[PDB]
Amino acid sequence: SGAIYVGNYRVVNRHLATHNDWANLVWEDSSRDLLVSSTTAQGCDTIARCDCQTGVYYCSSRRKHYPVSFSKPSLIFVEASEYYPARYQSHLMLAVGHSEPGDCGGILRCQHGVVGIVSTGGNGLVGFADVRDLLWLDE
Numbered sequence: 001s002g003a004i005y006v007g008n009y010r011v012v013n014r015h016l017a018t019h020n021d022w023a024n025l026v027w028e029d030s031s032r033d034l035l036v037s038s039t040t041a042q043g044c045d046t047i048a049r050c051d052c053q054t055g056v057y058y059c060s061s062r063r064k065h066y067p068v069s070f071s072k073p074s075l076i077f078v079e080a081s082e083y084y085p086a087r088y089q090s091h092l093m094l095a096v097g098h099s100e101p102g103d104c105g106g107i108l109r110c111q112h113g114v115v116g117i118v119s120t121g122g123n124g125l126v127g128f129a130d131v132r133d134l135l136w137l138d139e
């Protein structure tokens, strides 16, 4: 679990969005596993606007943060799960690091701010949904 709170927006994994997220929907994209909903309170986070390929993510299955080197956002094949058919997920960045299904939502940060959230993984890999291209989150 996990979310990014920026301005009057809440960013979550689309597959973990709640009834309240869908009732306050701003934007969603199944191909990116992202959903953004509106909030009444002002957020606590800020978004990186950079090309960093190193950062630190929170891993809830170890209660710890780990440093990672991650690939640029790209179209990556993701196996079928209980939430999606087998498909290409876009704007996804892979890294070597521990992750389990419940780790989705953990934040990845670089020195400039929030880069993305855990969205996929397996066998010593962890994949993050990028949010740095969503310029409208800041306005």
Ligand SMILES: COc1cccnc1CC(=O)N1CCC[C@H](C(N)=O)C1
Pocket: 015, 033, 078, 081, 083, 084, 089, 099, 100, 101, 102, 103, 104, 118, 119, 120, 121, 122, 123
């Ligand atoms: C962090 O997730 C891990 C980690 C290790 C092993 N299986 C997972 C789960 C996983 O990859 N997915 C299930 C939920 C939806 C995901 C998606 N974006 O399509 C795919």
Ligand SMILES: [Zn+2]
Pocket: 048, 049, 050, 051, 052, 110, 111, 112, 113
């Ligand atoms: Zn950065």
